[PDB]
Amino acid sequence: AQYDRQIRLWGLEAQKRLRASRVLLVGLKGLGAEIAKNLILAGVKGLTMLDHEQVTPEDPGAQFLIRTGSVGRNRAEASLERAQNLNPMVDVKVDTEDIEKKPESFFTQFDAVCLTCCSRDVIVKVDQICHKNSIKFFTGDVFGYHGYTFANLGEHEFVEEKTMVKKKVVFCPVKEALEVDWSSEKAKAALKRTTSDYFLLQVLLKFRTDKGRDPSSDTYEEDSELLLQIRNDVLDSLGISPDLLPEDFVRYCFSEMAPVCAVVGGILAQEIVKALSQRDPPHNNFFFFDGMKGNGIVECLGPK
């Protein structure tokens, strides 16, 4: 049982691996603020908050890390002082350049990358860069009562208790997870067991691609009509009945709600912690939250 003690010493080392990990966080809006707070309190070595946008007059006056009346300055700069005060042992850097213009060498300094408020093209490109450098990749967003998290940990090994063993779990790229072939006979069966939040994510990603923005409460009339059109185009492109996503979805997917940010940000940050520490199994590979029904569903989409 010599291999038994090799796992035990590697299990207690999980906290040291967490305290030595550096994380990149892109997007410091409602969801990113919660993720940053949870990671900084968790004790990671460093956290880099990257956001190219500035605080707009349409942003809510009450914000977590951004002091009231900061309209005009960078969102990551305004979030620095409050984020750093959460834990002095964590060095919190601030980056203002566009994530899409960063070189590949910029990401190598990080052990994990978490994207929020990014387009589909940026999500895929960064996940491909991270897989190219063996960097753990995460993404998430919130919209109305709904939220989601995605993880791509490649070939991930961890320690789990029975009474303690080591396992391996294989993740797939986000590109394959976002374009699933539903024409197989086995896929059509899993299609009945797949939560509609996955297709809600597809509709909103397509909205963010075309409009260059997320649905807004101010323009709820025009946005909800376009969302109803996009869900017909996207679900027809995948060979699926458009009625798999009910028509009333436009009423519960607008703006970012603070309670939804806390739920999704809590689940996402804990998945990053257990991945950096390589302790406990991670969710493979999607998590979908429905704030209206109280549902938190883990789906494995991509493989096969």
Binding site: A42, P259, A262, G294
Partner: protein
Amino acid sequence: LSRGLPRELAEAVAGGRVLVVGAGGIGCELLKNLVLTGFSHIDLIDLDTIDGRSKAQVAKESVLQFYPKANIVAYHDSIMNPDYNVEFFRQFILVMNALDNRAARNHVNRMCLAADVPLIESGTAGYLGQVTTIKKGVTECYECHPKPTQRTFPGCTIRNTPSEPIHCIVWAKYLFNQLFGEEDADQEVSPDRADPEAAWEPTEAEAISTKEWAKSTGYDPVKLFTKLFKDDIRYLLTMDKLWRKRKPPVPLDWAEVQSQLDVKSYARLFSKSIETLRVHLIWDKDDPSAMDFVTSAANLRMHIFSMNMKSRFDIKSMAGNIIPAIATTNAVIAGLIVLEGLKILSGKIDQCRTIFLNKQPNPRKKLLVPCALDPPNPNCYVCASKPEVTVRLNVHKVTVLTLQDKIVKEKFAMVAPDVQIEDGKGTILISSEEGETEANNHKKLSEFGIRNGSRLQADDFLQDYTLLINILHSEDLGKDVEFEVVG
């Protein structure tokens, strides 16, 4: 829509007055979510009382630093104070609990039932958590089914700043797991220099484990009293930011406390249980050497941090559901609490659910599992119509004082009880008005004619609660049991 919410719901949130009971636990995350969601009129109260100052007032000061335009009303008196009557609770459209003290949660449950105000209850236990809604006549209340006491605390409190008294019993139970059990990072007992409140700066020479220092030492009891009760305590004093408003601890010396519940004997018991355990692992609350190790190690730490120690029977009664906390679990639960509150403010109480937070997905891929709220338990002794219980005791040995303090106040969670006998004459046993029935406290129940089958009507007018108590006389039980509730 307004920030994803309908116009009518955002108005109810802006004009709605809510009550948060408890500044600790999930309260910090809950206050953030309430303010960020748009709740302007928030009342905060806890269990402490002043003559800084109270926890609610201290928490209000930190809230206004994050958002100065918040309208926080902080109370410096305990929620158990009789001033917070039903009329007080009727001011709010929603009450959210952040306490873990069972007696206070039972009280708030009864106050919200009497005020017909929805009460959101919750709990945490590591990765696990749950949220539910309590509404009179619709759902089951907090006491429809008994539930264990939540003893889930962050590692920063157990290791660095343990506010008495359960935090030391947890530290003693963590100490048992590190030395004689499955060593875990969530149950470390060493000084937590990663605590963000500590702001630990390394020294010049700084440029280790608790079980390893006992492994090479051969589990020396006198060496384990050292390092753990004097060197770790003197290392806590090097973190100066921890001792600015709270009193700092004082180390214990073995060569002094032994040369001069009992104080100096618990140090002797600490060295006796280590020698027995090293000859023999899973912690068992019915084990002789295991409970003696926890009782001695906890009481030694309770004296280091300046507080009255506790007996062995009280340590055994506690230390049941000791689960280390996970900070993200509080953030998830606090978010669900406000989500359930939005449904209540929307007039859609039927859409409320009991939500379970699991560690891993269930057989149906659900990590967060909702379920329909259960109807009121017809056998609940609190929220049912004309509730009754049966108590088995010796009417010739039980005094009125024992009935008042241990049965009606402790077991049945009444704050200010009035107890009379259903004998036609309305004989008064116990009065909530001080200066009336103190002369009865020493008398046996049989001196008032209470015999087998006697019925006592216990009224708690603050809680708007009436309980009928059937007396079953029994001379068995044993010379250690004074009473027991049937069923």
